[PDB]
């Protein structure tokens, strides 16, 4: 009865309109999540979150009754609804952590969108390449964060006060973001940074064409 | 009679020279558009814009009489001529908006150039990929603009005063531009930015090879 | 007699050693060109440049006598020797211009190196793509330098005082260098910059795979 | 006897567990290397390095007795153990140089990891491309570091005081890192930088697809 309505968006006009509200409520909740942090708004933002939560719970229980937890879609629905009920029952770090989780509302759009599902499949099918990329980046960062520290220990006015403190700079230079908050001053540090830029470029460039190929294959096969 | 002259640049020497003036007037109008904003120039810039407008109107009406509005080329011609007649007839935001539209003179070069037409066709044939890229970038930005805000709410001297205020930073880091006007200060914010750089690199890298392939196909087929 | 010695580096051991001095003198001249500008050195740098010039003139005249000007290699040799004789015969802008030309000594290494010759051939065979890239970059820069100026004319403390003054910023953002000396301040300027980054990324990405393919073809065919 | 245990990680459960300690000790030594530079720690860090050194010496001598130096793996083991014995026997520049070498502990993970071995093989098989890339980058840097100096010698407040001093800026701009500590001020310097950005982009882009192809071939053949 309701399973066809909530699982066949193209079966009938009654089911087609339902998905529109399903997307509108998600977008409204996402919008209202960001506006609570604006200083100008330091009651109206709670009576609408309550309706959004009620709609999410109804949408979950309708498909829960008419059968489940082995797929990723149902897991996301449960996570999106938990944080509201926790704060109704009732350390600041725990409060910030449970407030941050609310951001997982954006992942409920994956049931409607197809490109996001393709991206998820591509991410699932390319774990080894991502691990290799992280490994190479860590090796390069730890290799380049010590040379720049040892090549500028003579100067009393150097930003790099320790090897860990030079980690940030390294990941800034290898990714070519270049914020510029920390820069080498001596000649040897400049040579180290010049080598670091090229090494980071090559390290980032090497793994990507495999993930790109997997995404292209999935996108072309699905569409 | 005049249709062959104004639509066959290689038919005769009389038609070939006409296109030269057609390009020279466009370039002169583009040049004169920028120089009105220089502080040194705070009359000479109006009596030449009038001649440019007269030439544009003549060029439009010659092909309008000898036949139309279903193509994009004729639409651009109408837009390029409207703003002059509006200000002759006679709120500051409306004035700035109608002054900004004048910049559409540069698109009249598409009738003469071929690579710009190829670029337009490629843009037309790859709407879905551009939409997917924008979707992925928005998802990543909204995902990373809240973690960095929640990981630095303890510090009283943090730049990120709200989740929307951290949008800019995010799009600066994911695109690897790295202006450096806003940077994370705490350890957790630095970890968030380190993850954000890689995520933005991958997100930007994934969609492009399809638009690149479409442009290559169009460029090779046309030329 | 001398033509075989000066044109067959692998014919004999006598000719093989000659090229070593030919490279050493070029490298020494390049090194001595940069060190004259160091503040510490504000006579020794002239008596060695004289010997370098004498060797260049001898190397030119040996192959000039035993035959010519239709190739690019002989043109570079003449340019490298002219600036010394001009200053011996005897407005500050002309002096700086004729002093800057001396930097063309580095191009004499193209006769010995092969990868540089391959790069030159690739550059010669891909003029149209470079022109198209420059055209697209100019169009994007002129398009984005006016919107950011018109979207921030209200603020009295904006860096962008004119449309030309916003050219620099634009080419900084489209190339993703991001120096950070000029940044948008208002919301609309930030949106304009966010669009500009993506537009520049796509514009730069589109033309390159043709020049890359030409270079790969030449490199694989030669080697 | 012990050769099978120390060279066949998958032969038996006794050999499988040994590699776990071999990785744990390496990771612990790497971690303890960085924490000595933290200002908070200005004895505990020596009695654990001693155990790490003892384990490394034992692991080396077990495979040394049961046979050698022609491979790269055995060379790395010797280098990792030398610096400890040098300081036990007993100019500040020599001390910093011999302290910096300790960072070579990270390369001992290559015996266990496979992707790092693939990366090493790819680096070995692509020496010519790396040399060509370095050559092109040096040519571009020396070409662009003199034009920007000669185009801004008129201004008394220019950062570029000499041609060598402008090397850093150049390698910052060609790699698109853009720290922003040194920027051109005059119009001509800005034009030079605008050309430099594009030239560096093309120069970096040209060599890479060969190293990428070699890495892809090795990764697909091995796995
Ligand atoms: C960051 C920016 C955005 C990143 C990521 C945003 C993407 C969020 C998840 C994508 C939607 C989930 C989804 O559609 O499930 C599908 C994927 O099939 C799977 O089971 C894989 C699960 C998702 C992969 C998560 C790995 C994250 C690794 C670390 C990645 C970091 C299955 O659908 P079905 O089989 O059709 O039923
Ligand atoms: C792949 C690596 C990606 C990214 C690696 C870069 C990590 C973020 C850099 C933060 C620097 C930092 O924390 O400075 C505060 C000092 O350092 C500390 O006191 C604790 C830092 C431990 C973080 C270790 C992460 C892996 C680094 C190894
Ligand atoms: C920004 C930098 C420059 C970007 C863009 C600069 C390019 C401006 C337009 C290109 C010239 C227009 C043109 O030649 O029409 C042709 C394209 O055929 C079409 O009908 C497509 C219309 C143009 C696509 C605009 C989509 C913009 C999407 C959002 C894009 C953002 C038809 O010609 P014909 O068929 O031969 O007759
Ligand atoms: C794809 C996203 C591309 C780009 C997304 C980045 C948008 C530009 C960032 C501007 C930040 C800003 O406006 O700060 C002023 C505060 O914010 C506000 O008061 C209003 C901002 C609303 C803009 C929403 C755009 C989509 C963001 C979601
Ligand atoms: C900037 C970084 C370095 C850029 C460039 C550094 C490269 C300098 C020139 C390369 C060496 C010249 C050369 O070897 O001639 C060969 C090329 O055949 C030609 O005739 C093409 C001439 C050189 C192309 C110059 C176009 C510059 C366009 C604008 C480019 C900007 C012929 O040799 P042969 O046929 O074997 O006899
Ligand atoms: C491809 C474009 C590449 C690069 C285009 C970027 C050009 C460099 C930007 C310099 C900005 C500048 O000069 O500011 C001083 C004000 O402007 C002037 O007074 C004169 C500037 C005229 C330069 C016109 C070049 C093409 C710009 C159109
Ligand atoms: C910087 C970031 C990280 C860069 C580099 C980190 C990688 C460090 C070395 C890789 C592990 C070494 C190795 O596994 O040997 C294998 C490679 O076969 C060789 O003999 C090549 C030797 C290593 C190449 C070093 C060239 C460095 C050039 C300059 C490069 C700069 C042989 O193993 P096997 O044949 O199976 O026995
Ligand atoms: C490939 C080139 C890669 C990178 C080339 C960039 C090299 C790092 C730039 C350092 C600038 C510098 O040292 O300023 C102090 C002044 O200069 C000196 O007093 C000595 C500098 C000599 C370094 C020569 C290296 C090759 C430059 C030619
Ligand atoms: K950058
Ligand atoms: K960059
Ligand atoms: K930057
Ligand atoms: K910067």
Tell me the domain boundaries of chain C.
1-120, 121-221
Residue A11's Cβ-count burial label (10 Å; 0-12, 13-18, 19+) is exposed
Distance CA D91, CA C193 (A): 52
What lies within 8 Å, CB to CB, of C103 at 6+ separation is C33, D142, D143, D146, D147
Put simply, whether C181 touches A (Cβ < 8 Å) is no
Distance CA C182, CA D185 (A): 12
Q: What six digits make up the tokens of D204?
A: 């970096």
For residue A113, give the ligand nearest its CA: 1
Query: Is the torsion defined by CA of C104, C108, C110, C113 positive or negative?
Result: negative
Q: What angle do CA D156, D160, D165 make, to 5 degrees?
A: 145
Q: What six digits make up the tokens of C101?
A: 């030309």
Q: Are B161 and B137 in contact (CB under 8 A)?
A: no
Q: The tokens 């890239």 sit on which residue?
A: C133
Distance CA A135, CA A207 (A): 11
Resolution to one decimal, Å: 3.0
Instruction: Work out the angle between the directed axes of helices D127-150 and C115-124 (0-180°, nearest 10).
Output: 70
Distance CA D151, CA D159 (A): 12
Inter-chain CB proximity A153 and D96 less than 8 Å: yes
CB contacts, 8 Å: C136 with chain B? 115, 119
CB contacts, 8 Å: D180 with chain B? 180
CB contacts, 8 Å: D198 with chain C? 133, 137, 175
The rounded Å distance from CA D71 to ligand 7 centre is 11
Site to substitute for ligand 1 among B132, B133, B139, B174, most atoms within 8 A of C-beta: B139
Phi (first) and psi of residue A93, to 5 degrees: -65, -40
CB contacts, 8 Å: D178 with chain B? 178
Helical (H) or strand (E) element with B174: helix B167-174
Taking CB atoms within 8 Å and a gap of at least 24, the contacts of A101-105 are: A102/A33, A103/A33, A103/B142, A103/B143, A103/B146, A103/B147, A104/A76, A104/A79, A104/A80, A105/A26, A105/A29, A105/A30, A105/A33, A105/A80
Q: What six digits make up the tokens of D121?
A: 């093989």
DSSP state of D36: T
Taking CB atoms within 8 Å and a gap of at least 24, the contacts of B94-99 are: B96/C150, B96/C153, B99/C150
Residue among A220, A183, A176 nearest A202 (CA): A176
Q: What six digits make up the tokens of D56?
A: 């490394």
The answer, yes or no, to whether any atom of ligand 8 lies below 6 A from the CB of D52, is: no
Residue among D208, D206, D210, D214 nearest D122 (CA): D214
The rounded Å distance from CA D175 to ligand 12 centre is 13
For residue D88, give Cα distances in angstroms to D29, D75, D82, D83: 18, 22, 10, 9
Put simply, whether B87 touches A (Cβ < 8 Å) is no
The answer, yes or no, to whether any atom of ligand 7 lies below 6 A from the CB of D108, is: no
Q: Are A180 and A153 in contact (CB under 8 A)?
A: no
- Chain C / chain D CB contacts < 8 angstroms: 77
Distance CA D147, CA D189 (A): 8
Name the residue facing D99 among A139, A150, A201 (closest C-beta): A150
Residue among D71, D53, D51 nearest D61 (CA): D53
- Conformational region of residue B81, where left means phi above 0, alpha means psi within -120 to 50, and beta covers everything else: alpha
Rg of chain B over Cα atoms, rounded to whole angstroms, equals 24
Q: The tokens 């697909």 sit on which residue?
A: D220
Q: Are A136 and A171 in contact (CB under 8 A)?
A: no
Q: Can you give the three-state secondary structure of A91-157, one letter per residue?
A: CHHHHHHHHHHHHHHHHHHHHCCCHHHHHHHHHHCCHHHHHHHHHHHHHHHHHHHHHHHHCCCCCCC
3-class SS shares of chain A: helix, strand, coil, % to 5: 75, 0, 25
Q: What six digits make up the tokens of C194?
A: 């966010």
What lies within 8 Å, CB to CB, of C41 at 6+ separation is C35
Closest ligand 4 atom to residue C187 Cα is: 13
Q: Can you give the three-state secondary structure of B8-73, one letter per residue?
A: CCCCCHHHHHHHHHHHHHHHHHHHHHHHCCCHHHCCCCCHHHHHHHHHHHHHHHHHHHCCCCCCHH
Q: What six digits make up the tokens of A35?
A: 């506006």
Put simply, whether D179 touches A (Cβ < 8 Å) is yes
Q: The tokens 């970059």 sit on which residue?
A: C137
For residue D125, give Cα distances in angstroms to A203, D114, D146: 16, 17, 35
The answer, yes or no, to whether any atom of ligand 7 lies below 6 A from the CB of D120, is: yes
Q: Can you give the three-state secondary structure of C69-118, one letter per residue?
A: CCCHHHHHHHHHHHHHHHHHHCCHHHHHHHHHHHHHHHHHHHHCCCHHHH
DSSP state of B206: T
The rounded Å distance from CA D72 to ligand 7 centre is 8
Distance CA D216, CA A212 (A): 13
- Chain A / chain D CB contacts < 8 angstroms: 77
Q: What six digits make up the tokens of D116?
A: 């790092």
Distance CA A186, CA D132 (A): 27
| Most distant CA pair in chain A, distance | 77
Query: Is the torsion defined by CA of A74, A75, A81, A82 positive or negative?
Result: positive
Distance CA B33, CA B26 (A): 11
Distance CA C25, CA B19 (A): 53
Put simply, whether C168 touches D (Cβ < 8 Å) is yes
B68: number of Cβ within 10 Å: 7
Q: Are C78 and C61 in contact (CB under 8 A)?
A: no
Phi (first) and psi of residue B175, to 5 degrees: -85, 0
Residue of D nearest to C98 (CA): D150
Q: What angle do CA C172, C174, C177 make, to 5 degrees?
A: 45
For residue B117, give Cα distances in angstroms to B114, B120, D48: 5, 5, 69
Taking CB atoms within 8 Å and a gap of at least 24, the contacts of B129-136 are: B129/B207, B129/B210, B129/B211, B130/B207, B130/B211, B132/A115, B132/B207, B133/B203, B133/B204, B133/B207, B133/C198, B135/A113, B135/A115, B135/A116, B136/A115, B136/A119, B136/B203, B136/B206, B136/B207
User: Mutate which of B179, B181, B214 to disrupt the C interface (most C C-beta within 10 Å)?
Assistant: B179
Q: What six digits make up the tokens of C130?
A: 């470079």
């Amino acid at each position: 009865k309701v399973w066809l309505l909530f699982e066949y968006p193209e079966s009938s006009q009654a089911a087609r309109v339902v998905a529109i509200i399903s997307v509108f409520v998600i977008l409204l909740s996402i919008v209202i999540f960001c506006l609570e942090t604006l200083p100008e708004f330091k009651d109206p933002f709670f009576l609408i979150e309550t309706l959004c939560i009620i709609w999410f719970t109804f949408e979950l229980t309708v498909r829960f009754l008419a059968c489940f937890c082995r797929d990723v879609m149902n897991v996301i629905d449960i996570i999106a609804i938990i944080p509201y009920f926790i704060t109704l029952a009732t350390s600041l770090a725990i409060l910030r952590v449970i407030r941050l989780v609310r951001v997982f509302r954006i992942f409920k759009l994956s049931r409607h969108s197809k490109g996001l599902q393709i991206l998820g499949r591509t991410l699932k099918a390319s774990m080894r390449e991502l691990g290799l990329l992280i490994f190479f980046l860590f090796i390069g960062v730890v290799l380049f964060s010590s040379a720049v520290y040892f090549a500028e220990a003579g100067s009393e006015n150097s930003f790099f006060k320790s090897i860990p403190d030079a980690f940030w700079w390294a990941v800034v230079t290898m990714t070519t973001v270049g914020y510029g908050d920390m820069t080498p001053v001596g000649v040897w540090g400049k040579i180290v940074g010049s080598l670091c830029a090229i090494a980071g470029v090559l390290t980032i460039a090497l793994p990507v064409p495999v993930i790109v190929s997997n995404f292209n294959y999935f996108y072309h096969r699905e569409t």
